[PDB]
């Protein structure tokens, strides 16, 4: 049996051969929106993952959030103390894979220092503030004792501690905030240690400041111990982020979230996974078709078309 018009497919021994009926195997178009089911999507409005992690004021809505996919918009910006994350990609990757911002406040005993330091560049409410998940320790009175504190991990989940080192701009500011001429920070565990020597130097003017914060992280495995030993320039943690394992991930996309059902999410939106191959994007999340370079692949579903 034959049909009037036919579709041209390609075989081992033929560039083009006409057949009665042929289907497409490459999903090359996207709906343009991200379905919010079944995957727990978290739309990050104006907030990058690290900003919500640290506790940027305009990100206070993201506290204790959880997600199956964190969509990070291109309009996101930082509006707090100018910070800098050495190995930013690794921290972002592991935080995103953990899949929760659940922050447990721990009781740290800082003796002889002024806690809750703040700045005018990070304005919380009407007054000066700081990152909600960090604690800026400054000299109390006229001394800055060598802080030496510890926290044991007695639970059976990893703990993620986010701390930082404050690089001042001028030596006067260094000695005004921390009486030592050049302090250092050392966060260590049983298996590894990490020491930072803060430097003093002017930096490009960002949000009214020349000083910076360097953000580091330390993962305390179960049964391990954290020891923080510093004599200046320490941005102490306030607690720990509960690390996890799961199917969580992060994605950079400006697609709007929509109320629908779909399993495969690309930055171009949710796409159906009926077809085995897709050409939309090479970044995928969920049960997605395999990305291919071709924009069309015709599978013959009928007999050779001889009309």
């Amino acid at each position, epitope marked *: 049996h034959a049909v009037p018009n036919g579709t041209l497919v390609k075989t081992i021994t033929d560039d083009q051969i006409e057949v009665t009926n042929a289907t497409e195997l490459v999903q090359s178009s996207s709906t343009g929106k991200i379905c919010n089911n079944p995957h727990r999507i978290l739309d990050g409005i104006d907030c990058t993952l690290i900003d919500a992690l640290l506790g940027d004021p305009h990100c206070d809505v993201f506290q204790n959030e959880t997600w199956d996919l964190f969509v990070e918009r291109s309009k*996101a910006f930082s509006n707090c103390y100018p910070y800098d994350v050495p190995d930013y990609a690794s921290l972002r990757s592991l935080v995103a894979s953990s899949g929760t911002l659940e922050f447990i406040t721990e009781g740290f005993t800082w003796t002889g220092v002024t806690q809750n330091g703040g700045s005018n560049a990070c304005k919380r409410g009407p007054g000066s503030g700081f990152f909600s998940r960090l604690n800026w320790l400054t000299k109390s009175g006229s001394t800055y004792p060598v802080l030496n504190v510890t926290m044991p991990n007695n639970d059976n989940f990893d703990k993620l501690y986010i701390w930082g080192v404050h690089h001042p701009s001028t030596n006067q500011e260094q000695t005004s905030l921390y009486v030592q001429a050049s302090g250092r920070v050392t966060v260590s565990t049983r298996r590894s240690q990490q020491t930072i020597i803060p430097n003093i130097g002017s930096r490009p003017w960002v949000r009214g400041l020349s000083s910076r914060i360097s953000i580091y992280w330390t993962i305390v495995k179960p049964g391990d111990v954290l020891v923080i030993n510093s004599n200046g320039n320490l941005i102490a943690p306030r607690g720990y982020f509960k690390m996890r394992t799961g199917k969580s991930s992060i994605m*950079r996309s400006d697609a709007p979230i929509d109320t629908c059902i779909s399993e495969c999410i690309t930055p171009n939106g949710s796409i159906p996974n009926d077809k085995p191959f897709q050409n939309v994007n090479k970044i995928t999340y969920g049960a997605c078709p395999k990305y291919v370079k071709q924009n069309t692949l015709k599978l013959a579903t009928g007999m050779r078309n001889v009309p």
Partner: antibody
């Protein structure tokens, strides 16, 4: 504060080419796409085009294909729209407006033009 | 995707105003004060942006969106456009004595 400051008024002659610039302030230009909208005097708004900063892919109306070019100077956070082969009908106010989506989607499909410049009065006639 | 809407609505200050755009296919509502850049006042289809007083409201039926202005006054009177890319024909808002 998010602000868009456009060039001064331009007075041209038919068949020439004009270049309108839009200086952004208060945000990074590559974070937002930028649409260009014209308004002939008392003729209501007419969408001209859309530049996707951060990847440079453009989209113009068929009426303006070829004779309009949009580029983005990222160093100065500036965006330029040049019109070649000006006609008399192109006398209008031109506005640059900020649109949200640059990565994954074409912004103007799903997002509005939340911030507008003051617009420049390009008059090609006498 | 032609857009249509009922033009030249005249009213005194302080009552209801309704404008109806019938998209034939996200419609957003912009306001152009005389001699001023247009201003966004309805995002999405019924959402309002920052700085827009809650007097403005949007309502979407199957394929017709409608913008309602409540208790209007001088600054609420301008030209109004619906956008979906294609713009609307424009409806003028004028005070009445």
């Amino acid at each position: 504060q998010v602000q868009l400051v456009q060039s001064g008024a331009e007075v041209k002659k038919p068949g020439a080419s004009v270049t309108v610039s839009c200086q952004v302030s208060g945000y990074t230009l590559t974070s937002y796409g930028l649409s260009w909208v014209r308004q002939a005097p008392g003729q209501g708004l007419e969408w001209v085009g859309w530049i996707n900063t951060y990847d440079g892919q453009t989209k113009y109306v068929k009426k303006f294909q070829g004779r309009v070019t949009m580029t983005t100077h990222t160093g100065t956070n500036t965006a330029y729209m040049e019109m070649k082969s000006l006609r008399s009908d192109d006398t209008a106010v031109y506005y640059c407006a900020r649109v949200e989506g640059v990565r994954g989607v074409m912004g103007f499909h799903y997002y509005p033009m939340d911030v507008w410049g003051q617009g420049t009065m390009v008059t090609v006639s006498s | 995707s032609v857009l249509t809407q009922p033009p030249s609505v005249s009213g005194a200050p302080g009552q209801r105003v309704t404008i109806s755009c019938t998209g034939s296919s996200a419609v957003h509502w912009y306001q152009q004060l005389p001699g001023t850049a247009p201003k966004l006042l309805i995002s999405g289809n019924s959402n309002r942006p920052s700085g827009v007083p809650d007097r403005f409201s949007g309502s979407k039926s199957g394929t017709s969106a409608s913008l309602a202005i409540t208790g209007l006054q001088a600054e609420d009177e301008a030209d109004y456009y619906c956008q979906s890319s294609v713009f609307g024909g424009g409806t003028k808002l004028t005070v009445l004595g």
